[PDB]
């Protein structure tokens, strides 16, 4: 894989530039899961006295030529190389690695292996062994409560827009409570441990009926469709609440589900 | 009278009355004179320091309601008993210094109807320094964010596609709508609507362009989702052939035609 030769080009460079205290690799690569249509991701931790002026236009040239960089939304470099594979850049202070230990809440990792690219004073290794086989408890009345509500708010929203003919925004709020439904969807089927990215693997990760449900809540820009999405949404959240009932005590109730139903034709 | 200014008035009498309680501000359709039946009523209300409060005891005082959770933002949100959505932010009389703010995020028409109640008067002269004020999207920043962005986007999510990870792609879709959307307002130079890009899009863009836009839509289907991708990039590839006569980009031609290629690949 090209993204595997990028790999061993990230190392290199980490291990041997004077300016780079740390790298971490995250994501597929460090799960198993990396193919040819995967990116490749880092966090790389500088000397903290030249973090501010590092030249980091010129240092991702030096792992590729790349045809597009850019600072996304989130502060994270975010590079297209030439032979098209994307590469996410987090560089940040050697300081600031006291995060790390905040990423045990935000998914399952099994092993930290991977994730060691290099580490110069021996701290980085330190910081993985904290967050070395974390698997956050999804499955609790607080997610499916806060789910439902949610849930149940956008619904209303969207079906609002619907109804005044704002088709557009109606079809965005629906993406919105995709989300939620997948991750409500996994509660139930207690395949939670992709939570945060909902929809990776779907296709092996739920049951072929509450997939062919989720399906049917999806929609073009179009009337019709969008009001067929909407009903089909609500009817598989109303069977989700009742599976979900049996483990927790809920504070949206079928007879709530009932009212937004009855809503849709009013 | 609609059930939402019955609400409203509710809202007015009691921040009035309530000791424990400074200012409250209306925001949202209601003071943009774009209410209606399908509208929700949204405030912040602004409590002395030292009682910032039982905001469910309260929100009932307003009316009955269904449900109250907090959103991911921190903003109590609420369905009444007669299916009115109402959102709420209760925050100490200390925080009013937020509303300049404001003006950073969208246009600002009418703050006397934002004015509810304002004990001490500073509502009022916070609200005046935003009065009429709007930023202005029409910049190259902008442009080559947004461009890149999408870039970004659409070859993440041609690439799950192509992996066959449907739902994600479908995801991932939805984020470029939202960039497109932008980008239109862009090309047209009609981007107050920035943050809410959807809002009243029906009115705000060309239809030539609207119906573009529709054909970046799909529902969770193989071949609709490598239609929907196809269409967004040609979209795009529209939009900054008319971007690039008023900014320099770094997005250019050639690469939307290099990502263009690549779907075949
Ligand atoms: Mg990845
Ligand atoms: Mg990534
Ligand atoms: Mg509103
Ligand atoms: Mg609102
Ligand atoms: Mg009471």
């Not at 880092?42 to 790349?66: C, E, G, M, Q, R």
């Not at 930290?112 to 290794?125: F, N, P, R, S």
């Not at 062919?212 to 469709?225: G, H, N, S």
Request: glycine share 4%; with cysteine; hydrophobic share 40%.
């Amino acid at each position: 894989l090209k993204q595997k030769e990028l790999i061993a080009n990230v190392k290199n460079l980490t291990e041997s530039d004077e300016r780079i205290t740390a790298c971490m690799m995250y994501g597929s690569f460090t799960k198993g899961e990396g193919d040819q249509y995967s990116d490749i991701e880092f966090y790389i931790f500088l000397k903290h006295s030249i973090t501010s002026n590092f030249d980091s236009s010129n240092w991702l040239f030096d792992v590729a030529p790349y045809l597009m960089l850019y600072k996304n939304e989130y502060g994270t470099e975010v590079v297209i190389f030439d032979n098209l594979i994307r590469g996410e850049f987090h560089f940040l202070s050697e300081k600031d690695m006291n995060i790390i230990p905040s990423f045990k809440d935000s998914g399952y990792i099994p092993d930290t292996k991977a994730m060691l690219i290099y580490d110069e004073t021996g701290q980085l290794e330190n910081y993985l062994s904290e967050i070395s086989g974390a698997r956050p408890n999804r499955l609790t009345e607080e997610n499916a409560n806060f789910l439902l509500c949610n849930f149940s708010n956008l619904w209303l929203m969207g079906i609002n827009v619907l109804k005044r003919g704002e088709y557009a925004r109606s079809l965005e709020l629906l993406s919105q409570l995709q989300k939620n439904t997948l991750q409500l969807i996994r509660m139930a089927e207690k395949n939670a441990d992709n939570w945060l990215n909902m929809s990776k693997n779907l296709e092996k990760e739920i049951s072929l009926e509450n997939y062919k449900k989720f399906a049917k809540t999806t929609a073009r820009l179009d009337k019709v469709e969008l009001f067929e999405a909407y009903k089909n949404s609500l009817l598989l959240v109303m069977d989700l609440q009742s599976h979900l009932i049996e483990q927790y005590n809920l504070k949206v109730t079928h007879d709530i589900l009932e009212r937004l139903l009855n809503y849709i034709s009013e």
